[PDB]
C-alpha cells in the first residue's frame, strides 16, 4: 500500500486509503503524542495564497483548469487584493464555495446531499431589518410546508475595520430557557445566555417549556436589533407515540427546520460571519440528544415512569427502552405531520454511500467518527465499523466567538 | 501545551499533564486525526528498565532507597552482560496492573488494582502451557464468582521463537465455512477453526462449539489441548419476559479472557500473557450476537419479536437489540456468573477518570473503545472528553504466529 491514511472497514472487509488528507492545509488538534480527536471545540500574503487555492478548486470544478479565463480570474483577485486588500467573489463561485464547505464538514452525516443546496445571496444587506426579510424569506422558502429543502443564506463578508454582521442565536429557532429560583430552568437548558441577553435588549419573557426565541441580529458596528418571527413562520411537530396513548398529554414538542447561525462560512481566505443554513433533521438529534441529555430536557425518567419500567437499578436497561420509544414517537410525529425526517438508520446507510462517491471523487472523505455515529444504537448502523480520517479542508464551516 | 479536557454534562475541566509521561506514538499528526482506527539496542532496554524500575519504586515510596539503587545497579550489570534482564516477581506484578491500569481501550480498569497475576516464568512446554491455562481458568471463574487475573508465560529472547498462543480468546465457538460462502458458528473464529482442524481436531457441526487451544512452544509446531467441558462455564440465553427466545437455544460463554496481545514491562516482551476479567453485557448482547458478520442475530430476535422488518423507520434493530442485552444481563443474574451492565460500568469509569486525575494528572482514554455499542449518549461517557496516549507498561498487539 501507499504511504496514505489506510482505512479499514471492519464490517465488509475493505480497504481504502486517503489521498485527499494531502490537501488540508490546516492542522487539527492532534500529535504523535496525543489524540484530542473526541475534544467538541479544537492577512497580506496569506490571503492572496488562500484565495489562488479557492480560485484553482473552482476552476477545476468546471474543467477549467489552467485556461485563459482561470488565469485572468487569479490576476484579478491579486490586484484587487493589490490595491485594496480584499477581494469578492463571483455568485457562481460563492454557490460552488457553499456546497464545498458543506461537502467538507467533517461533523455532518447528511453530506450525500451536498451537491442539493439553494444559495441565497445576501452580500446586498445592509441593514439589521433586511437580514430579518432575509432570514425569513430563507424559513419559507427551507421549511416549504414541510417538504424541507437544503438552503444557506450569506451576509456580507467581514471588512476591514468595519464591525461583523452577526446573528446572536446559536439557531433560528431556539427554545426559551428560564432560570428558576430553585436553580432549576424551565425550557431548553442550552438557551439560558441568549434568553437572558433578549431579556436583557427588552424581549418580554413568556414562562412555557416551548417557548421560541426572537432573534437578536447586528449590522455592522449596531447594537444587535430584536425581531419576533411571526409564529405561522416557525413549523413545529406536537409529538404522539404510534402505540402507547398517553405519549401525546406529555405536550411535547419540536420544530421543523434545524437552522445553525452561529458558524462562519471561510471561502478563499473571506470571511462570512452570518451565513445560516438549515437541513432537515436526522431523529436522533430530537429524540436522543435534545429530549434525553440530562442538561438539556431530561425527559427519560418521566417517560420511563408513563411505561412503568423498573428505573431503581441500571440493569432493568430502562434509559434504553424509554430513549427507543421517543425516539419511534419523533420519527411518527414527523412521519404523520408530512415534515421531512431522516432516521439514524437510514442517514448512516446513506453517509455510507456518501463515503463511496468521494472514495472515487476525490480520494477520501473528512470525518469526525465521534461525531457521525449516532447517539443510540451505534454499532446497529453502519458507520460504526467504518474508520475514518478526519482533517480540516476549505472551504469551512468555523466555530467562531460570541459576539458579546 | 497540555490538553483542556472538558465534561459536557458538567462543565468542568480538567488539564492532562499525565500525557507529557509518554514516550511512543499514536497514529495522528497535527494534518490528520486518525483515532478511529482499530490498528497501528542495549541502551534503548536499559532506558526503559530503568523508568520502569523507578516507576516500581516510587510506588512503594521507596524512591532513592538502597534497595532501589542496587536494584537498578543489578538491571545495568544484567543488560551490559546479557544484552536483556529478569523481573522480579513483585515487579511483574507491579508492572501488569500497571499495563491494565495504562490500557486506553478498557472500560474496566476502576478494578485495576485487583488483579490475580500467576507468574508462568517458569513454562518449558506447551504441555505446562496448558496446565497453567486450566488453573488460570478455574481461578478467575470461581463458579460464576468471576476474579481478573492475568497468567504470564516466559519473556521474548532474542535467540528463538516466542511462546504463544495461537487463539484470541481462551475461549471461543467455531466458525465453519460452508461451500456456499456462509459460516456455521461465529465467523470471527473461522481462521483459527480451520487452523485447528489442520493441526488434527476433530471438528463438531454446532453454532456453539468451544475450540481447542493452539499452545506454542517457541520454534515447534503448535501443540492442540481440548479443553475438559466442565472448566468452562456457560450460560443459556433466556428472557425475563419473553418465553420464546430460549427456544433460539443461544448461549455465551463465561469468561473473557484475551490471549493474543503483548505485555511489554521495562522493555521485556511477553508475548503470551493471557488475561480476563468479567463481560459488560454489550459486548455479547450488542457486538458478538448482533454484529452483522458475527452470529447476526436481529433479524430473527425482530421476527420473533412480530415487529415491522421492512423499514428502518419503524425502529425494529433497535428494540430487537434492547431485548437481546437485556436478556444477557437476566441470564447471567440468573445463573449468578458476574457480569456488569453498559451504565454501572460507565459510571464507574468516570469515578475512575476521576480517581486518576487526582492520582496521576490525567487518565488515557480511547472514546471510540469506551463508550458502549448502544445508548452512548444515555452514558455519562459520552459527554465527556478524553485524551488517548500510550504510557509504558502496556498491553499491545501483535502479528499472528503463522
Ligand atoms: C439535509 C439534511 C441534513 C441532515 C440529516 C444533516 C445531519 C447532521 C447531523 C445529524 C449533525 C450533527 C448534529 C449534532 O450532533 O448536533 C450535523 C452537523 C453539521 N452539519 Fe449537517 N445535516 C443536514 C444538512 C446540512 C446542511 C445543508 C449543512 C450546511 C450547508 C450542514 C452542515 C453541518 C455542519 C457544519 C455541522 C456541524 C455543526 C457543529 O459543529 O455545530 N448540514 N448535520
Ligand atoms: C474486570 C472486568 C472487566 C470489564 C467489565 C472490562 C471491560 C472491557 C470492555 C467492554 C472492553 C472493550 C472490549 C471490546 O470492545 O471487545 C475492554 C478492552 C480491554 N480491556 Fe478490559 N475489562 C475488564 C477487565 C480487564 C483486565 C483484567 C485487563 C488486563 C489485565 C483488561 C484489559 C483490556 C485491554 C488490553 C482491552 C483492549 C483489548 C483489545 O484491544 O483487543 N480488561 N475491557
Ligand atoms: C461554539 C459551537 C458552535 C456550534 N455551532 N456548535 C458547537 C458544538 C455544540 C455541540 N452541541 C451543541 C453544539 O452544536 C450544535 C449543532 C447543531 C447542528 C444541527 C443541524 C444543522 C443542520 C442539519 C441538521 N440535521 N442538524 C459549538
Ligand atoms: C489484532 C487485534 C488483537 C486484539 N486483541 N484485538 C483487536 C481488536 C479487535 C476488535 N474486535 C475484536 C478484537 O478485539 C477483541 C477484544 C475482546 C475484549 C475481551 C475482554 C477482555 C477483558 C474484559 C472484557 N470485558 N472483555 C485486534
Ligand atoms: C465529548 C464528546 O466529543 C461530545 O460529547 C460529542 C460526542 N459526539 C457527538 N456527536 C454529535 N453528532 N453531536 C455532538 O454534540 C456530539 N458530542
Ligand atoms: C472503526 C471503529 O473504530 C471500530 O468499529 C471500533 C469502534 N469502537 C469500538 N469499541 C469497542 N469497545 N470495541 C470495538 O471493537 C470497537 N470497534
Ligand atoms: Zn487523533
Known sequence: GPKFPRVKNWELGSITYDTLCAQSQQDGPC??????????????????????????????????????????????????????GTYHLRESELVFGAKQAWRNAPRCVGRIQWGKLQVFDARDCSSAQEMF?????????????????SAI???????????????????????????????????????????????????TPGNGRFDVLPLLLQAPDEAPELFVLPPELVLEVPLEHPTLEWFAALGLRWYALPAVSNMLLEIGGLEFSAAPFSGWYMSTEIGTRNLCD????????????????????????????????????????????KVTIVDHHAATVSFMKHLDNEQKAR???????????????????????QEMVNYILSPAFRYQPDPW
Open 294 to 337: 440530562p442538561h438539556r430536557y431530561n425527559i427519560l425518567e418521566d417517560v420511563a415512569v408513563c411505561m412503568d419500567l423498573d428505573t431503581r437499578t441500571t440493569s432493568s436497561l430502562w434509559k434504553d427502552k424509554a430513549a427507543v420509544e421517543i425516539n419511534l414517537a419523533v420519527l411518527h410525529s414527523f412521519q404523520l405531520a
Open 363 to 385: 480520494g477520501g472523505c473528512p470525518a469526525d467518527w465521534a461525531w457521525i455515529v449516532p447517539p443510540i444504537s451505534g454499532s446497529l448502523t453502519p458507520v460504526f465499523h
Open 31 to 84: 500529535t504523535p503524542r496525543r489524540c484530542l480527536g473526541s475534544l467538541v471545540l479544537p492577512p497580506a500574503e496569506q490571503l492572496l495564497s488562500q484565495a489562488r487555492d479557492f480560485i484553482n478548486q473552482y476552476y477545476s470544478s468546471i474543467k477549467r483548469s489552467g485556461s485563459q479565463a482561470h488565469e485572468e480570474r487569479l490576476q484579478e483577485v491579486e490586484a484587487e487584493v493589490a490595491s485594496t
Open 133 to 149: 426579510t432575509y432570514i425569513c424569506n430563507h424559513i419559507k422558502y427551507a421549511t416549504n410546508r414541510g417538504n424541507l429543502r
Open 153 to 203: 443564506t450569506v451576509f456580507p463578508q467581514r471588512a476591514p475595520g468595519r464591525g461583523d454582521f452577526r446573528i446572536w442565536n446559536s439557531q433560528l429557532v431556539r427554545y426559551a430557557g428560564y432560570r428558576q429560583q430553585d436553580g432549576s430552568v424551565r425550557g431548553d437548558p442550552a438557551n439560558v445566555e441568549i434568553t437572558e441577553l433578549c431579556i436583557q435588549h427588552g424581549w
